[PDB]
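User: Can you model how chloride ion sits in this protein?
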Amino acid sequence: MNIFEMLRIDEGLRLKIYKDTEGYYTIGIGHLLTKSPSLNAAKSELDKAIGRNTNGVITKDEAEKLFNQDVDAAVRGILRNAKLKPVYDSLDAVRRAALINMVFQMGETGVAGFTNSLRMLAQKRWDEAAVNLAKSRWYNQTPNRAKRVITTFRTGTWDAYK
Ligand SMILES: [Cl-]
Ligand SMILES: [Cl-]
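Assistant: Here's the modeled complex, given as structure tokens:
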């Protein structure tokens, strides 16, 4: 199991514009297009991202290309973040993937905001961090996903995904 397979389970794959859990226009493997309520704005953002007149539909290959870009961007975003990087550097391979999953979903800023949990993770106090992670809007809104990510941090294995 690896980050890609992990996020592919968490996000799914849709080849036509759809709205995410928050009602935002998305496509592919969790690729957010816009927070704007307008479908045209989404379609415009889509064409600009793909480089062709898509008319709101993309192919598998195209979805996979945005996904590679988005995963690469999340990692580079963590490594650029003065708050995230040291956490990231202190973790093992599996837990690093859990942190990348969070950033992919809620952005760097978003995650950098879990101050207390981050400190706990940095300190390798797994159970405590898991508990702290759970008191969040994130957990309350998307609990099944949150729970898989939390178990991954708590245990250091991919069991939640097998
Ligand atoms: Cl893009
Ligand atoms: Cl969920």
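A couple of observations from the model: The CA atoms of residues 47 and 60 lie 15 Å apart. The chain has nine helices and three strands.
User: Helpful, thanks.
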